[PDB]
Enzyme design. Structure first.
Site, PDB file in Angstrom:
ATOM      1  NE  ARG A 197      -3.242  -1.528   3.327  1.00 44.07           N
ATOM      2  CZ  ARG A 197      -3.125  -0.600   4.282  1.00 44.07           C
ATOM      3  NH1 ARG A 197      -1.977   0.053   4.461  1.00 44.07           N
ATOM      4  NH2 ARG A 197      -4.165  -0.314   5.063  1.00 44.07           N
ATOM      5  NE  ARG A 235      -1.054  10.738   6.513  1.00 44.59           N
ATOM      6  CZ  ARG A 235      -0.556  10.968   7.725  1.00 44.59           C
ATOM      7  NH1 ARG A 235      -0.759  12.131   8.361  1.00 44.59           N
ATOM      8  NH2 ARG A 235       0.139  10.018   8.306  1.00 44.59           N
ATOM      9  NE  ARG A 251      17.664  -1.328   3.455  1.00 45.38           N
ATOM     10  CZ  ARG A 251      16.437  -1.103   3.937  1.00 45.38           C
ATOM     11  NH1 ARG A 251      15.597  -2.115   4.186  1.00 45.38           N
ATOM     12  NH2 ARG A 251      16.052   0.139   4.173  1.00 45.38           N
ATOM     13  NE  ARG A 269      14.239   9.938   7.840  1.00 47.91           N
ATOM     14  CZ  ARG A 269      13.278   9.650   8.718  1.00 47.91           C
ATOM     15  NH1 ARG A 269      13.484   8.739   9.666  1.00 47.91           N
ATOM     16  NH2 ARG A 269      12.093  10.288   8.623  1.00 47.91           N
ATOM     17  CD  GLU A 325      18.748   7.579   8.960  1.00 48.07           C
ATOM     18  OE1 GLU A 325      18.401   8.252   9.959  1.00 48.07           O
ATOM     19  OE2 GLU A 325      18.048   6.638   8.523  1.00 48.07           O
ATOM     20  CE1 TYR A 369      12.905  -0.335  13.136  1.00 45.35           C
ATOM     21  CE2 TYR A 369      10.553  -0.342  12.655  1.00 45.35           C
ATOM     22  CZ  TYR A 369      11.667   0.268  13.213  1.00 45.35           C
ATOM     23  OH  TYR A 369      11.528   1.474  13.866  1.00 45.35           O
ATOM     24  CG  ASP A 374       8.402   1.183  15.178  1.00 43.06           C
ATOM     25  OD1 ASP A 374       9.405   1.863  14.826  1.00 43.06           O
ATOM     26  OD2 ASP A 374       7.392   1.014  14.430  1.00 43.06           O
TER      27      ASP A 374
HETATM   28  C1  FAD Z   1      17.806   3.914  12.689  1.00 47.20           C
HETATM   29  C2  FAD Z   1      16.900   3.519  13.828  1.00 47.20           C
HETATM   30  C3  FAD Z   1      15.821   4.370  14.132  1.00 47.20           C
HETATM   31  C4  FAD Z   1      14.736   3.897  14.886  1.00 47.20           C
HETATM   32  N1  FAD Z   1      13.675   4.741  15.172  1.00 47.20           N
HETATM   33  C5  FAD Z   1      12.597   4.289  15.912  1.00 47.20           C
HETATM   34  C6  FAD Z   1      11.529   5.163  16.184  1.00 47.20           C
HETATM   35  O1  FAD Z   1      11.445   6.284  15.655  1.00 47.20           O
HETATM   36  N2  FAD Z   1      10.458   4.699  16.927  1.00 47.20           N
HETATM   37  C7  FAD Z   1      10.417   3.390  17.394  1.00 47.20           C
HETATM   38  O2  FAD Z   1       9.431   3.033  18.059  1.00 47.20           O
HETATM   39  N3  FAD Z   1      11.473   2.528  17.130  1.00 47.20           N
HETATM   40  C8  FAD Z   1      12.565   2.961  16.393  1.00 47.20           C
HETATM   41  N4  FAD Z   1      13.638   2.096  16.124  1.00 47.20           N
HETATM   42  C9  FAD Z   1      13.710   0.730  16.794  1.00 47.20           C
HETATM   43  C10 FAD Z   1      14.331   0.728  18.204  1.00 47.20           C
HETATM   44  O3  FAD Z   1      15.745   0.896  18.156  1.00 47.20           O
HETATM   45  C11 FAD Z   1      13.947  -0.565  18.963  1.00 47.20           C
HETATM   46  O4  FAD Z   1      13.998  -0.329  20.359  1.00 47.20           O
HETATM   47  C12 FAD Z   1      14.761  -1.815  18.568  1.00 47.20           C
HETATM   48  O5  FAD Z   1      14.820  -1.875  17.173  1.00 47.20           O
HETATM   49  C13 FAD Z   1      14.125  -3.147  18.956  1.00 47.20           C
HETATM   50  O6  FAD Z   1      14.539  -3.564  20.248  1.00 47.20           O
HETATM   51  P1  FAD Z   1      15.581  -4.747  20.604  1.00 47.20           P
HETATM   52  O7  FAD Z   1      15.731  -4.733  22.100  1.00 47.20           O
HETATM   53  O8  FAD Z   1      15.086  -6.077  20.100  1.00 47.20           O
HETATM   54  O9  FAD Z   1      16.945  -4.536  19.774  1.00 47.20           O
HETATM   55  P2  FAD Z   1      18.213  -3.649  20.134  1.00 47.20           P
HETATM   56  O10 FAD Z   1      17.840  -2.241  20.544  1.00 47.20           O
HETATM   57  O11 FAD Z   1      19.112  -3.612  18.934  1.00 47.20           O
HETATM   58  O12 FAD Z   1      18.971  -4.408  21.325  1.00 47.20           O
HETATM   59  C14 FAD Z   1      19.949  -5.376  21.034  1.00 47.20           C
HETATM   60  C15 FAD Z   1      21.164  -5.298  21.960  1.00 47.20           C
HETATM   61  O13 FAD Z   1      21.739  -6.602  21.975  1.00 47.20           O
HETATM   62  C16 FAD Z   1      23.143  -6.434  21.948  1.00 47.20           C
HETATM   63  N5  FAD Z   1      23.818  -7.656  21.522  1.00 47.20           N
HETATM   64  C17 FAD Z   1      23.768  -8.255  20.291  1.00 47.20           C
HETATM   65  N6  FAD Z   1      24.533  -9.382  20.349  1.00 47.20           N
HETATM   66  C18 FAD Z   1      25.073  -9.487  21.597  1.00 47.20           C
HETATM   67  C19 FAD Z   1      25.930 -10.424  22.195  1.00 47.20           C
HETATM   68  N7  FAD Z   1      26.375 -11.446  21.472  1.00 47.20           N
HETATM   69  N8  FAD Z   1      26.337 -10.253  23.524  1.00 47.20           N
HETATM   70  C20 FAD Z   1      25.878  -9.169  24.265  1.00 47.20           C
HETATM   71  N9  FAD Z   1      25.022  -8.236  23.664  1.00 47.20           N
HETATM   72  C21 FAD Z   1      24.631  -8.393  22.351  1.00 47.20           C
HETATM   73  C22 FAD Z   1      23.421  -5.224  21.069  1.00 47.20           C
HETATM   74  O14 FAD Z   1      24.697  -4.693  21.361  1.00 47.20           O
HETATM   75  C23 FAD Z   1      22.241  -4.334  21.447  1.00 47.20           C
HETATM   76  O15 FAD Z   1      22.612  -3.452  22.483  1.00 47.20           O
HETATM   77  C24 FAD Z   1      14.717   2.565  15.348  1.00 47.20           C
HETATM   78  C25 FAD Z   1      15.811   1.736  15.052  1.00 47.20           C
HETATM   79  C26 FAD Z   1      16.894   2.195  14.299  1.00 47.20           C
HETATM   80  C27 FAD Z   1      17.899   1.174  13.824  1.00 47.20           C
END
Ligand code: FAD
Ligand code: FAD
Lengths: 388, 388
Positions: A173, A177, A254, A285, A308, A359, A361
């Protein structure tokens, strides 16, 4: 044998920290979080820049939003939220446009006002150029002019591939708007953490039953740690392919690079985020971090911006978004079966964006963890229930 | 001698209903509100349009906003508020523009993006065409091109006068915002009453100690009312000059006409409020009332619009905005001396937009009423302290 910890959590992003906080506090257990980076929070980590004092999101702009009342109630135990309401602008051909595509962008681009109905008809006519059934699916949804201006250059930068060469299934989609509403997100609740992400993330981990070990890779310490707490499950939120030593091939990802610059001016762009849609501009961005917190007392003679950039993640680069081709999903299918046996034999659970190849959030990562906790981890740790 | 009423209030607008509710409720007094119209609320009155059920602000768009926490607390005793945030667009030469003047409009009008500093410089240059110290003052503040596009034809239709012939002192400042922020109001609190203005107004008058008589002019009934409650003060919120038989002349006002139209489409303009800047469009604004309450279940096949026209008021037109010529201010100074004599000899207090010859927003009307209650009326009613 007395156990040292009751749970190991690998990764201190929002998924890991939600797991760790619910288990520590609700079940009254001892949790060790292993984080391989120099700081907590995963990609939501923030830090004040030295010259200005302005809180910078280190891995891209993080905007908080949810329509989940449970998640909203949960996150506000650790932080207050600001009344920030996210709006994005797009730069195309030396002109700034209201964004996403709506009546504002449509009137600006085509040089006159279109009525909601005149706009419906305008898009339906331009989209008629290609049938969605048989550059892309994109044209077939929004027309060639809007595609070539606002979607082509921007997709080419994000994917680092010519859009003629990406799968049509990539877009389902591409809505316009038919109203002047340019509020970016459409969820019930929204805002920025008043004291920043890092304060919120620490408060999640502050309980005395949670220990966080920084600069510590799980594959370096797992053999020294499990023997002393042999019944403790492992909630693994690192890369799924990496967990299994890449035996079946690598999942494609990516990356993003960021260039933070401090400028001797008060305001670089007059908003938080500017998309750059043109292929001849190397970044996707620019973020201007002062605009994320208007309510703070930030200096008006200086500002911090972040450019970025997207590229092809080489082995070694930090993974951000899945490429998700047809061959990646077979590979994910393979690794999911391997993980399912690792849960039965070793009590390792897979979660989060990396553990899962999706992915997520923040709010979806938190709700995901609350689900893992309620349905898989709490029954095991409190009662007797198998993890499978 | 036993009194029938403790207080008379003339007019059931926000000023008068505030007075009445505070006195009835806090002091335990019987209040009579005389209203000359067929409904309460004065100009904030709203009504469901019959064909669609859409709530229409009968005397123009009414948007509530305040930074006064005391007022925000007070108004929430009578109604809930919605999360609506007012934005206005401007129509000029067949093209819709972000408003008020800021980076969005500036970039649209000149057809290239201007940085905050580039836009400061641009406006400094164009406004250098005329020095403020020695058409208008407007050109000296924002330059000729933005004046002729967005201010010239608009002020002309408002005042029904060529701006060449209007006072320079009528514009203090004419700011251009140097960000993309397009939120119209600058106050802490904002929203629309959830059950509408009429429901809110009816609640203020709900106490059994408050009596409202509609279709009743004070000047018709004052002689038959005051003998029975001889010590009751009067709070008069009607026209100041009318109170004194226009014996010193007539204060100059501007009126408005409103044309309501039901249209057989779901959406006419995609926003609540469109300003029409061109002189060759007879109306000043179009309101579209579904966009005031998107949370309501309004039909998707029909919509109500209202066109707003400004004119020269005649003797028997409804007054809305003071003209405020130097001659009106001398006339006002004369009537205020008459008013203060009237307070001294027969306990009549003058309040509100009409009783005072001022434009007043709802929240300033409510704050002004609380002030007269605190400092003038309550000590008189409670303790016997003089009104002057
Ligand atoms: C560019 C960017 C912008 C974003 N913007 C938004 C936004 O606007 N709004 C929104 O709601 N979300 C956004 N997100 C998503 C946000 O970062 C989330 O909180 C996340 O993607 C999902 O949570 P997570 O805990 O699974 O992963 P992560 O936040 O990546 O946590 C993973 C952690 O595990 C660790 N790790 C990996 N392997 C190991 C290992 N072997 N030993 C010890 N530690 C390890 C890493 O170092 C990392 O600290 C964005 C993400 C990015 C990449
Ligand atoms: C075009 C329009 C748009 C507006 N938009 C906004 C807005 O967006 N936001 C905002 O905050 N405010 C807005 N206002 C102002 C708003 O209506 C206020 O509530 C009002 O200006 C101040 O309250 P008031 O009680 O003094 O005036 P009023 O509402 O006019 O109260 C006067 C009352 O006195 C009555 N009366 C006069 N003489 C007599 C008499 N002799 N006998 C009996 N009754 C009499 C009248 O019938 C009327 O009911 C707007 C006003 C107008 C006209």
């Amino acid at each position: 044998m007395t156990a040292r910890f009751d749970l190991f959590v690998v990764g201190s992003g929002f998924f890991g920290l939600t797991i760790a906080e619910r288990v520590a506090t609700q079940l009254d257990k001892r949790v060790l979080v292993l984080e391989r980076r120099p700081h907590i929070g995963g990609n939501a980590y923030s830090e004040a820049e030295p010259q200005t004092g302005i809180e910078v999101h280190k891995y891209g702009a993080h905007l908080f939003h949810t329509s989940n009342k449970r998640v909203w109630d949960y996150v506000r135990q650790f932080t207050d939220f600001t009344d920030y309401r996210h709006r994005v602008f797009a730069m195309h051909n030396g002109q700034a446009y209201q964004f996403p595509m709506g009546l504002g962008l449509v009137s600006q681009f085509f040089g006159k006002y279109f009525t909601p109905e005149q706009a419906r008809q305008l898009i339906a006519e331009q989209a008629a150029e290609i049938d969605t059934a048989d550059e892309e699916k994109a044209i077939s949804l929004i027309g060639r002019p809007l595609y070539e201006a606002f979607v082509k250059g921007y997709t080419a930068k994000q994917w680092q591939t010519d859009p003629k060469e990406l799968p049509a299934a990539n877009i389902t989609r591409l809505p316009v708007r038919y109203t002047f509403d340019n509020r970016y997100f459409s969820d019930t609740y929204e805002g920025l953490p008043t004291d920043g992400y890092t304060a919120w993330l620490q408060n999640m981990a502050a309980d005395h039953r949670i220990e966080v070990r920084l600069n510590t890779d799980w594959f370096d310490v797992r053999g020294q740690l499990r023997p002393g707490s042999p019944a403790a499950p492992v909630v693994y939120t690192g890369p799924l392919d990496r967990y299994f030593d890449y035996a079946e091939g690598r999942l494609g990802w990516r990356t993003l690079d960021f260039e933070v610059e401090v400028l001797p001016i008060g305001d670089f762009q007059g908003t938080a985020v500017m998309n750059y849609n043109d292929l001849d501009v190397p970044y996707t961005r620019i973020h201007e971090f002062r605009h994320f917190h208007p309510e703070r007392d930030y200096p008006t003679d200086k500002t911090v911006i972040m450019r970025e950039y997207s590229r092809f993640a080489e082995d070694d680069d930090e993974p951000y978004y899945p490429i998700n081709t047809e061959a990646d999903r077979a590979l994910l299918a393979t690794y999911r079966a391997r993980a399912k046996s690792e849960t039965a034999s070793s009590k390792v659970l897979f979660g989060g964006r990396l553990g899962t190849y999706q992915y997520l959030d923040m709010h979806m990562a938190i709700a995901s963890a609350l689900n893992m906790y309620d349905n898989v981890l709490a029954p095991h740790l409190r009662d007797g229930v198998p993890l499978l």
